[PDB]
């Protein structure tokens, strides 16, 4: 999945 701070 995406990292905690991704987007």
């Amino acid at each position, epitope marked *: *999945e*995406l*990292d*905690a*701070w*991704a987007s």
Partner: antibody
Framework: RITLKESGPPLVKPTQTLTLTCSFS??????????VGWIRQPPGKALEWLAI???????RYSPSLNTRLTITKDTSKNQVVLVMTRVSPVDTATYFC????????????????????????WGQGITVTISS | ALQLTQSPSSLSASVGDRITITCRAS??????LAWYRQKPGSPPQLLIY???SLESGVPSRFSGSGSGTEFTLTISTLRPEDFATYYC?????????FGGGTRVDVRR
């Protein structure tokens, strides 16, 4: 000044459970967005990511080792523990814990996520050998 | 899972040279990439975070660039302490991932 240090048994036998402790200072695990992760390095090999735990208690694990790993934090003792079950010879390695910065904030408002892109401070590493 | 390939795995160099090392991700990781230098018997030391930011207390000869799938770390003027092993790490997707490392030794 942030410092982290790993502690645990230098020798462990196959099928046994390995419990490693990361004791740190210079930061609080209850601080916003901060994280502490574990990385291992088998002799002569590359670094391998194991897991990470954040202040809000969100946990993430290596998919490859997921079933044998547990990570928890003890905010009051400033420690993060990693438990690896059913160890085998292939787990012999140096284990490092490291700090992950949270987003930069301004008057309580996160304004920069750039510093979260790295593990900025590392422990010296603890050598663990797995043999019967 | 996502893969990080470092190039070259091994590199010969002499004091004073300018060297560059590359790290390529199998999928775009935006700018969430860090570079470390590791001396034998010591833990990795953060050099560059977020692809190009210079970590505090790290000497200016180090810099990094790139985004998406291609990244490069360059040491403008190599010093004796740079003979070591370098790693890149991606932190855009879980699990975070390290590259296979690139060894930099004294040329002869």
């Amino acid at each position: 000044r942030i410092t982290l240090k790993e502690s645990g048994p230098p020798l462990v036998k196959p099928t046994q459970t390995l419990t490693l402790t990361c004791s740190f200072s210079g930061f609080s695990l209850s601080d916003f967005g901060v994280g502490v992760g574990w990385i291992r390095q088998p002799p002569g090999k590359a670094l391998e990511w194991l897991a990470i735990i954040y202040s809000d208690d969100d946990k993430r694990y290596s998919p490859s080792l997921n079933t044998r790993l547990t990570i928890t934090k003890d905010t009051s003792k400033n420690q993060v523990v990693l438990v690896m079950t059913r160890v085998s010879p292939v787990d012999t390695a140096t284990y490092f814990c490291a700090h992950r910065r949270g987003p930069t904030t301004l008057f309580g408002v996160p304004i920069a996520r750039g510093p979260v892109n790295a593990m900025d401070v590392w422990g010296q590493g603890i050598t663990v050998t797995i043999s019967s | 899972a996502l893969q990080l390939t470092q190039s070259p795995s091994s590199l010969s160099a002499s004091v004073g040279d300018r060297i560059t090392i590359t790290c390529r991700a199998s999928q775009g990781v935006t700018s969430a990439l860090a570079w470390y230098r590791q001396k034998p018997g010591s833990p990795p030391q953060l050099l560059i975070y977020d692809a190009s930011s210079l970590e505090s207390g790290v000497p200016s000869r180090f810099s990094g660039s790139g985004s998406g799938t291609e990244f490069t770390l360059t040491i403008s003027t190599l010093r004796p302490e740079d003979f070591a092993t370098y790693y890149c790490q991606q932190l855009h997707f879980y699990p975070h991932t390290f590259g296979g490392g690139t060894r930099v030794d004294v040329r002869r």
